[PDB]
Every structure is written in structure tokens, then in C-alpha cells.
Design a protein around this nucleic acid. Structure first.
Length: 1133
DNA sequence: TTTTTTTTTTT
């Protein structure tokens, strides 16, 4: 049993000669400390090519962090404030996790410095005990010996519980042979369930006072059965687990530990970082849907009178719930939640109603009519009938439900960091009689005045259908995405985790196959690290040193292959000489229907051309064909034709060619890939392998062991400082199914499909018009071929294509022994896409540089297109948000938050009409214009927000500029200017890129300017202004009180609607004197006196005075006559 | 119109 004292004389300053990659990581994490501070989290994308020491670099970094923990615990043992810093290595696949853990242990055992072993054997045994691996519960159980499990059963005294013994004995007997695959499946399921039950029980006995003292052999048994217990005990602090397991958490003897809730100080290495976007998304898609009607009715019913203890452990918690209770009661009153809900009229059973919302501005309903919601009081029910109100009810219910979950999170934190979590949740839920929401709270744990983004608002999909078993009651089954994977990653960085994301394509410019790095840059700022120009040059030099193709005479040959229908026809005729025609051959022997013949001829021609060019090559021996489909038994007819062509060219060129059709993932499971390696090692001749992009994923190592007898003189080492070799010829078909679509069960709601459309709209890849059309077509059912057609129009699609190609040649370049000639055969459809690659080539692989250079040899701005789309989106969001805010203000009473939002928006626009940088907390009041300080547009501000256009696409259109609001005239007034300078309002528009959107300029900025000018002039003339109260807010601008007059005065600053207004005001406040005034205009225009009906009358009988101009537009001079005559009219009261 | 194969974990 080793101990920490083994490193007492260990030299922590002796480290191996660091590679430039290690130096780059160390330097970048050093500047992180300087710029962001010690406690700050970070994200460091590392575009390292795999096969040039990526795994060694990551694991060596992991080993260094293990040493610094030992060093700290030696030097600071007397401090007592022990902080066992957690290190994680996560990746998507189980095989890569296990392989990396094995490689770390091997690195510990066999690392040397200066020719001497790095660690003594006791030191090695100490480090290897700090490392833990956390598989799924089934495999965790099946790893354990019967001795260990019997020990933990006896020590916790479950060895007397009949069900436990029966289940364990059944599992052991099943495990006794377990050779058959279905036996393995059954054993897996049984082991998972039994492990769940056993941990549930032992957590029970450890929770109560009957604490079993773990020590020695029993302690080791538990630590083997529960590897997470070592982390809780402080005995281990390095974990190897998958992304799915990381998101779900792992058990110890107390409870389940969620790494996401305790990310402060953690260092997290994520292999294939961009792949984890899709994995995290798949985990977020799997949440359980919830009926909103039932949820809101339960919340309203239980919060009506149930209350908590009023003890010191519940301080300030009821105050967290007080707003939610008020909202629940008002909601239940407005929508009459005493009654249940049902549909009326149109056959709901014929087709259910589906509603989609992004919670901000993209709303789509499957019903062709606008469904409304009526509370019948005779038939006491709420009826959903087709004449909207149903979407309003659903949106409000969703808001209240999410509010309840967020308030529960806040109450859990107020109650307290993670051992207290379960107790807090159970105490709060049991005090309120809300135990039915326990699972929802457990899963859920992980506005114009704010930063708005899809990535932290997500989406909602609501399905309205009849309840199960009833034909007269309807439920609202809602499934949510509360955040995108980018939001989760940014949350981890903000929680304090240092994330080291390693992938050759870590910064691919796609939001479908990678995180949104525009959003991550906005949200993390400079906590999103980036290796610099000099660092990238050093890494490029290091990669060149290890892959010196040019000095060693290795030649990369790239050929783009078009379709070869004539040559394919010749081969087809030779394959079946007695058949009449080639199309007949395809239709009959190959099985290609006439509809698919044009495509199958298109792709089989290029593949066979590549194979012929490979076999005709003299000394190449290893060809990998990467297609989109597996050539297996389901395509056996096509294989035979390919096999015939291979045999023909083998006879013609006198080289035997072994073909490996259908190397599937399950094939590589049952029949290992080393069969190809063994054949290349022992048999003379060429090899052709037929795989797919999805089959040859990360971690599949395709190199083979070199046998110098068979290789000839073709191989040559390219490394400067030095036997295996790799692929020498590759065929790259154009990747096809590039929208994420998992076929299995949890994707039945198509939530992952709306996520992609909303991500593309967020990025600026789609206009809001296209995004909303695509969302509508998705809701009403959509062919994958049509969704894929929609996706193909983006530039995100092309970035994803290049990402797929860049990894294919990266995974096949894993050794330093190369042929004198490497053949790259590319589908011609990739030539246009690869020609458009324009990023910095410093970290590209040599094969990818060759592909791009060949594509460019035969030869639209994306940021501009993004600017147009984002201008439209920022306008549309402001357009819909203002209408909702105005609607809520006009629904009296107006809540405090709505008034605060209105004033905050107006104040922000007044102080900052333009901003130099992209704002954080008011980002969607503005748009980034192509011309600084001004822009043009064209669209109906009262009409459709999708039908807006913008910069030079509309050269003759309405201008948004400082001139068009006459701000310069406004400030030249002698009274307005001191008011503006004291209030901090802008006297002029800065020439900046971000200018306010057309909706803000027309509907808010101009009105705020007018109101501020009026209040500026009148305040200098003994007028006192009071706040309009919430009963009739936004009907009139200001309460006015003048010295010597006690009749209440009402102000409007810019006829039957106005009649409704003046009646509504005088109903509450009695007769009052009203002012209608425009701040700017012609002072020579006569002043009007109107009655309650806006009819001209005598000044003494008039109730409303209309001043056509308060300040002269010609020279900013105050209309003194108007003010004096208004004062005289006030004195006539 | 475009034209598929892969995966983890708890339940």
C-alpha cells in the first residue's frame, strides 16, 4: 500500500523535453492566468492533427497536472484547506475512453527522463491509483468479481435479503457462460437494473444512522464496485468517462454526483471536441415531455395555501416563491383553470395540433386556422375552437413552468453544495406537496434589456391531443430544449472549468457539426483562448518536421474524377456479354431500378475509375474507399460487379488485389480491422477496403505492420528523428446526409431538427423568412430530401463538407512511413467546395493542403450574407418584442417589470443611438451596418417583419441616420441641450457599425426624443412632471402639475380612439385638462382647442388643447406664444 | 427534391 510520501525526494522540476504542442498548451494556459485570473475557467481549442502525437500530448498534460497536485499536497499539507482538484478525460465513445486510460497507465509505467525511469515502482503504483474509470452501471457490475460483490453484500448485510440473493445468483449463473449475444444483452439489462437496486439500498443504509464503517478489504470492495467512491473519499481525482456519463453523473455510497454542479477548479480534456456538440444535443433531446395543463393546475392548486416551516433553515425562500404564487393565481383566474380543456368542432382525432415556438419571435402552428380558447360557463369547460389565444395560453404556461423550475434551483441554493441538494429538493417539494415534480426538478438542474440568443433560450414543441382513454379532455404535451450545446459549454466555462478541446477540426465554421464559436466568443470573451500567430507557426513547423514530405521526395497526387458512363458501360458489357444493353444489365443483375440508375451510374463510375487507377499503380498497396453507403450483403449484386472489375484489373496488371467489402462498425467488432493489417503484413499484393465516413470514426487506427520483404522499395520515412505504415491511396466520395438525424426512438419529436434551423437562423446563415418557412414545413411533416435541399443552400453546409473531408485524410495519415507516391482520388463534386476553402492553412494536414491546392488550380462573401440576414433577424426580434411589450402594457394593470423594461429600452436608445462594439445586454436593439452611422432599408413597420430589406440591396429606401430624426435641430434649442447634457443623452450619432434597428428608430427613438424635448422645455417654465400610474400607463406620456392650478393635467407628446382614451382617463380621475403637443413643427400654425369629442370650441369650454409645434424647426427657437397661451388656458380652469 | 451510418446511458 503506497502513500504520498513516496514523492518526498521526487524532483518535480525534472520534465521530459517538451514538444512544441506541450509548450503551446503551457503558454496558453499561462496567459489565461494573467488575463483572466486564477479562478477563471477557460476554453482552449487545440487543432492538433491526430497521429502526430495528439494523444501523447493530452496524456502528458494530464500527467503534469497529477504531479502538481502531489506537489501541492506535499508543500501545503499543513494548510488543511485541501482541494482535491478533479481532472476529467471525456470523449464520445467507450473504446476511446478505455484506450486513453490504458495509454495513460502505460505512459506512467514507461516514461523516461534522460534515459532513466521517470518514476519508481511505488511512485507508479501511487499515480495509477489516482486514476479511475467510470463506465455504465451494467458494465461496472459485470467487471466486478463474485468475491468483491459478496464482500459488499456481507459488510452491508444485504446477504440476508432474499430478492438480492436471488437476483445476484441469477446474474452470476447467466454470467457463467454468457457466450451467446442475446445472453449478453439479457445479462446487460439485468446487471444494470440490479446495480441500480443495490446502490439504492446501500445508499439507504449509508444515509441513516446505521453507517457501515468502510475499511480495508471491504473499503476496497466498495471502491471496486463504486469507482466514484474513490473520488468522494479523496483517494482518486482523475476520471476517464464518456460525455454521456459525464452529463449523467456517477454514484458513490452517498448519492449520485453530478460533475456539472461542481465544475469550479476542474480541468477537463475533451477529445474530438466538435463531435461533442451532437452528443450533448442527443442527451438534451431525451428529456421527458410534460403536460402543461396538468403541471400548471397542480402548481396553482398546491401553491394556493401550502407554505413552508418558517425556521432559520428556510430563510428568504418563501420570498423567492411569492411572485410565482401571484402569477399562478392571476393565470388561473384569467384562463379559468377550474375547468378542464377540450377541443370543439374540427376532428382533433383526425390530426392533432402541434405548436412550435422559439420563445422569442419564431412561432409556427400546424393548424391552418388561428385556434382560440373560450371558457364556457354553462358547459363549464375551456374549449379550443377554430376561428389567437391557444398559443398565448401555451406560451404563458411554459413561462410559468420554467419559472417554477428556476425558482426551485434558486431555493436549493438558498437552502445551502451537492450533498445538501437532494435534501433541499425533497424538503421544498414535500413542504409544498409537490412531490410529483421530483424527476422534473432533478433533470432540469443542469428580455430586450438582456442578452438574447437562441443558445440560452432554446425552443419548445407542444402537441395538443386528447388525453389517453378520454374523448372529452385534451392535454398539452410539451417537450423543451432549454439551451443548446453551445450554451452548456459556455455554462461549464463560466462555472470555472478549464476545458481543453482537442480535435483537428475544433474550429470548423459550422453550427450543425460543431459548437457556435461566434456565440462562444461573444459570451466568453477572452476566456475563450486562442493560440496565437507565432504559436501556430511553431506548431506548423513541428508538424512539418515530423512529416517532411518534400525533402524526402514523397509526392501527393490528387485527381478529381467525374462520371465515366462510357467506361462504366464498357465494363458492364464485359461483365454480362450476353445481355442486350447496359441499362438492362443494371436493372436486372445489379438490381438498380430505372429511377436510381442515373445516380448509381454516377457514383459507381468514379469509384471504379479510382480502383483502376490504384491497381494500375506499380507499388501502392493499401487503398481505402470512403463512400456514404456500406457495400454489404444488402448490396451483394453491386459487390460482384466490383469484384469482377477488380479481378479483371488484377489479371491485366498482374497484381493480386484482396478486397474487403462492407467493413462496417459491427464488422470491425466481430471481425477486427487487424485482418486487413495481417493480410498486408503477410500476403503479397494490393488491398482495397470499402468503408464509409461514419464507419471510420475517431479511434479506428488503420495502419498496418510493415514487412520489408513485401513492401519493395516504395516506403520511406519522412520524420526527421525516428515499423508501421498506413493508407497509400484513398477515394473520397462527396459526403451526403449532412443534417443530423438519429433514426432511433428519442428523435420521434423532431426536436433536433428544429434545433438546427434555429441555430442556422441564430448564426445568420438563414434569413428569418427562410428559417420560418423551413420550420413550418418541418412541423407539417417534411421529406429528408427536402430538408437536406434546404440545408444545401447554406455556406454552413460547405463548411461541414470540408470538415468531413479534412478528418478523412487526417485519420489516414497516422504514421511516418510513406510511399514515394500517395494517391488521392476525389469525387468531382467536391472540387467546387474544396476550391472555396480560404482559412489560414497553417494547421492543415499535408493531404488537405494538397486537395485544396489541386482544387484551386482550376479556378460570394459569407460575412456579407450574414450581415443581411442578421439585420433582418434583429429587426424582426425587436418588431415582435415591442408589440408583445406594448400589448402587455395596454393590458391594465401594467407590471413593474414592463415599465422598467420600457424605460430601460428608451434610455439605452437615447444615451447610445450607436455603439462601437457589439453590445451584450441590449444586443437586439441594434444591427451591424455596412456603412457607419447610417443605413437604408425598406419594409412595412406595421406589416410583415420577414419582408424587410436593408443595405445596398435597397439603394433607394428609408434612411436611418442622425439627419432623419433631426437630432441636430433638437439640441440647438437653448432648453433642450442642458437637459440632454445633464441626462447624458447623445447630442449626435457616433459613426459606428452598430446602429439601432428600423423599428427602434421609428417607434421608440423618435417618440422618446419628442417626450424628452417637451419635458426639457416645460421644466424650465415652472412645470412639474409626475409619473403616469399603472392603471392607464402608455395612454398618455406624463402627469403635469403647474403652480397655481390644482386641476390635474395630462400630457401627450408626439379621433374615436382618442375619445375612448379620454373617457377611460376621466372615468378614473374625473375631468382633467389634456395636452396634445408635437415638439417640432411650424410655430406659425394656429393652436387648437377641442372638447372631449375633439371638436373645436371656445377655449374656456375646451378640454383638450392641441399645440401643433412647441419648438421651431427652422431655428430651434422656443414657441413662447404657445407656452404663454397654454398657461393662460390653464388659468382659465 | 437527394440519395446513411453511427452511438451512450438510465430506465
Amino acid at each position: 500500500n503506497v502513500s504520498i510520501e513516496e514523492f518526498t525526494h521526487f524532483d518535480f522540476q525534472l520534465v521530459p523535453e517538451p514538444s512544441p504542442l506541450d509548450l503551446v498548451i503551457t503558454e496558453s494556459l499561462k496567459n489565461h492566468i494573467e488575463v483572466n485570473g486564477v479562478k477563471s475557467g477557460a476554453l482552449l481549442p487545440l487543432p492538433f492533427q491526430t497521429g502526430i502525437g495528439k494523444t501523447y500530448t493530452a496524456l502528458n498534460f494530464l500527467l503534469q497536472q497529477m504531479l502538481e497536485q502531489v506537489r501541492s499536497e506535499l508543500k501545503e499539507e499543513n494548510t488543511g484547506k485541501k482541494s482535491k482538484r478533479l481532472l476529467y478525460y471525456v470523449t464520445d465513445s467507450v473504446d476511446n475512453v478505455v484506450s486513453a486510460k490504458a495509454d495513460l497507465l502505460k505512459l506512467i509505467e514507461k516514461q523516461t527522463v534522460k534515459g532513466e525511469p521517470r518514476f519508481t515502482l511505488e511512485q507508479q503504483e501511487y499515480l495509477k491509483a489516482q486514476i479511475v474509470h467510470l463506465p455504465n452501471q451494467s458494465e461496472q457490475l459485470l467487471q466486478c468479481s463474485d468475491a468483491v460483490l459478496n464482500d459488499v453484500l456481507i459488510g452491508f448485510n444485504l446477504n440476508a435479503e432474499r430478492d438480492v440473493q436471488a437476483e445476484w445468483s441469477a446474474i452470476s449463473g447467466l454470467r457463467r457462460h454468457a457466450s451467446n449475444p442475446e445472453v449478453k444483452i439479457s445479462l446487460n439489462r439485468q446487471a444494470g437494473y440490479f446495480y441500480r437496486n443495490l446502490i439504492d439500498r446501500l445508499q439507504k443504509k449509508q444515509k441513516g444512522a446505521d453507517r457501515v464503517l468502510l475499511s480495508g478489504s471491504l473499503l476496497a470492495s466498495v471502491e471496486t464496485l463504486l469507482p466514484g467512491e474513490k473520488i468522494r473519499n479523496g483517494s482518486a481525482h482523475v476520471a476517464f468517462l464518456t460525455t454521456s456519463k459525464f452529463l449523467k453523473g456517477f454514484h458513490n455510497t452517498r448519492s449520485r454526483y453530478s460533475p456539472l454542479r461542481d465544475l469550479s477548479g476542474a480541468v477537463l480534456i475533451i477529445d474530438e471536441i466538435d463531435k461533442q456538440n451532437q452528443v450533448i444535443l442527443s442527451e438534451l433531446c431525451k428529456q421527458q415531455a410534460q403536460d402543461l395543463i396538468w403541471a400548471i393546475r397542480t402548481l396553482r392548486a398546491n401553491f394556493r395555501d401550502h407554505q413552508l416551516e418558517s425556521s432559520p433553515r428556510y430563510d428568504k425562500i418563501e420570498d423567492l416563491f411569492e411572485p410565482l404564487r401571484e402569477r399562478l393565481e392571476e393565470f388561473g383566474t384569467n384562463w379559468n383553470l377550474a375547468f378542464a380543456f377540450n377541443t370543439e368542432g374540427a376532428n382533433l382525432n383526425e390530426r392533432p395540433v402541434r405548436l412550435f415556438s422559439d420563445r422569442s419571435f419564431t412561432h409556427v402552428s400546424s393548424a391552418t386556422h388561428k385556434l382560440s380558447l373560450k371558457s364556457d360557463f354553462l358547459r363549464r369547460k375551456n374549449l379550443i375552437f377554430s376561428d389567437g389565444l391557444l398559443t398565448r395560453f401555451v406560451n404563458e404556461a411554459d413561462v410559468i413552468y420554467q419559472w417554477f423550475l428556476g425558482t426551485m434551483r434558486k431555493a436549493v441554493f438558498q437552502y445551502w453544495l451537492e450533498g445538501t441538494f437532494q435534501e433541499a429538493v425533497q424538503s421544498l417539494l414535500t413542504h409544498f406537496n409537490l412531490q410529483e415534480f421530483e424527476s422534473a426538478v432533478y433533470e432540469s438542474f443542469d428580455k430586450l434589456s438582456s442578452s438574447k440568443s437562441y443558445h440560452h433560450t432554446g425552443l419548445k414543441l407542444v402537441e395538443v391531443a386528447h388525453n389517453q382513454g378520454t374523448r372529452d379532455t385534451v392535454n398539452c404535451k410539451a417537450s423543451f430544449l432549454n439551451t443548446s450545446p453551445s450554451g452548456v459549454l459556455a455554462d461549464m466555462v463560466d462555472a470555472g472549468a478549464v476545458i481543453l478541446g482537442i480535435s483537428a477540426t475544433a474550429r470548423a465554421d459550422t453550427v450543425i457539426h460543431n459548437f457556435d464559436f461566434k456565440y462562444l466568443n461573444e459570451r466568453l470573451g477572452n476566456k475563450l483562448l486562442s493560440l496565437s500567430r507565432e504559436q501556430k507557426q511553431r506548431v506548423n513547423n513541428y508538424y512539418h518536421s515530423r512529416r517532411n514530405y518534400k525533402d524526402n521526395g514523397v509526392v501527393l497526387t490528387v485527381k478529381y474524377l467525374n462520371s465515366r458512363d462510357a467506361f462504366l458501360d464498357a465494363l458492364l458489357e464485359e461483365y454480362k456479354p450476353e445481355a442486350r444493353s447496359s441499362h438492362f444489365i443494371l436493372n436486372h443483375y445489379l438490381g438498380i431500378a430505372e429511377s436510381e440508375q442515373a445516380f448509381v451510374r454516377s457514383w459507381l463510375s468514379k469509384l471504379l475509375a479510382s480502383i483502376k487507377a490504384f491497381i494500375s499503380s506499380p507499388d501502392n498497396r493499401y487503398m481505402l474507399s470512403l463512400l456514404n453507403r456500406t457495400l454489404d450483403t444488402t448490396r451483394q449484386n453491386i459487390n460482384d460487379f466490383i469484384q469482377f472489375c477488380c479481378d479483371k484489373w488484377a489479371k491485366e496488371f498482374n497484381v493480386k488485389t484482396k478486397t474487403f467489402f462492407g467493413v462496417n462498425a459491427d464488422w470491425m467488432r466481430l471481425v477486427g480491422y487487424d485482418e486487413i493489417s495481417k493480410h498486408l503484413n503477410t500476403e503479397l499484393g494490393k488491398v482495397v477496403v470499402f468503408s464509409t465516413y461514419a464507419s471510420m470514426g475517431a479511434g479506428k487506427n488503420p495502419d498496418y505492420a510493415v514487412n520489408l520483404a513485401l513492401e519493395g522499395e516504395s516506403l520511406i520515412s519522412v520524420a526527421d528523428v525516428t515499423l508501421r505504415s498506413d493508407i497509400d491511396s484513398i477515394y473520397l466520395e462527396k459526403p451526403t446526409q449532412l443534417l443530423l438525424s438519429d433514426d432511433y426512438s428519442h428523435t420521434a419529436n423532431q426536436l433536433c431538427q428544429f434545433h438546427q434551423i434555429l441555430s442556422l437562423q441564430e448564426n445568420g446563415e438563414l434569413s428569418p423568412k427562410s428559417a420560418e418557412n423551413w420550420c413550418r414545413q418541418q412541423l407539417m411533416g417534411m421529406s429528408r430530401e427536402r430538408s437536406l435541399q434546404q440545408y444545401h443552400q447554406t455556406s454552413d453546409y460547405q463548411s461541414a463538407v470540408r470538415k468531413y473531408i479534412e478528418q478523412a485524410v487526417g485519420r489516414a495519415g497516422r504514421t511516418s512511413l510513406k510511399r514515394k507516391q500517395i494517391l488521392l482520388f476525389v469525387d468531382s463534386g467536391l472540387k467546387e467546395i474544396l476550391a472555396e476553402e480560404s482559412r489560414d492553412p497553417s494547421l492543415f494536414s499535408h493531404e488537405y493542403v494538397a486537395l485544396v491546392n489541386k482544387a484551386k488550380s482550376a479556378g460570394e462573401d459569407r460575412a456579407v450574407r450574414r450581415l443581411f440576414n442578421l439585420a433582418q433577424r434583429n429587426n424582426k426580434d425587436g418588431m415582435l418584442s415591442i408589440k408583445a411589450l406594448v400589448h402587455r402594457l395596454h393590458n391594465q394593470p401594467a407590471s413593474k417589470s414592463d415599465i422598467q423594461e420600457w424605460q430601460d429600452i428608451r434610455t439605452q436608445l437615447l444615451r447610445y443611438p450607436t455603439v462601437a462594439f457589439q453590445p451584450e445586454r441590449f444586443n437586439r436593439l441594434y444591427l451591424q451596418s455596412m456603412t457607419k452611422g447610417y443605413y437604408r432599408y425598406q419594409g412595412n413597420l406595421d406589416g410583415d417583419p420577414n419582408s424587410f430589406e436593408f443595405f445596398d440591396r435597397v439603394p433607394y429606401g428609408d434612411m436611418v441616420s442622425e439627419e432623419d430624426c433631426s437630432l441636430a435641430t433638437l439640441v440647438q434649442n437653448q432648453y433642450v441641450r442642458p437637459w440632454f447634457e445633464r441626462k447624458g443623452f447623445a447630442c449626435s450619432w457616433q459613426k459606428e457599425a452598430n446602429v439601432m434597428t428600423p423599428i427602434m428608430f421609428t417607434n421608440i427613438y423618435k417618440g422618446a426624443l419628442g417626450e424628452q424635448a417637451v419635458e426639457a422645455v416645460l421644466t424650465a417654465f415652472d412645470f412639474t412632471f409626475e409619473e403616469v400610474p399603472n392603471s392607464i400607463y402608455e395612454r398618455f406620456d406624463n402627469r403635469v402639475i403647474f403652480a397655481g392650478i390644482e386641476q390635474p393635467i395630462w400630457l401627450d407628446s408626439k379621433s374615436e380612439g382618442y375619445s375612448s382614451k379620454i373617457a377611460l382617463v376621466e372615468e378614473e380621475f374625473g375631468p382633467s385638462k389634456f395636452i396634445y403637443v408635437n415638439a417640432l413643427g411650424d410655430t406659425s400654425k394656429p393652436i387648437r382647442y377641442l372638447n372631449s369629442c375633439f371638436v373645436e370650441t371656445s377655449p374656456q369650454l375646451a378640454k383638450v388643447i392641441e399645440i401643433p409645434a412647441l419648438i421651431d424647426d427652422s431655428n430651434a427657437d422656443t414657441n413662447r406664444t404657445a407656452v404663454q397661451e397654454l398657461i393662460k388656458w390653464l388659468h382659465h380652469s
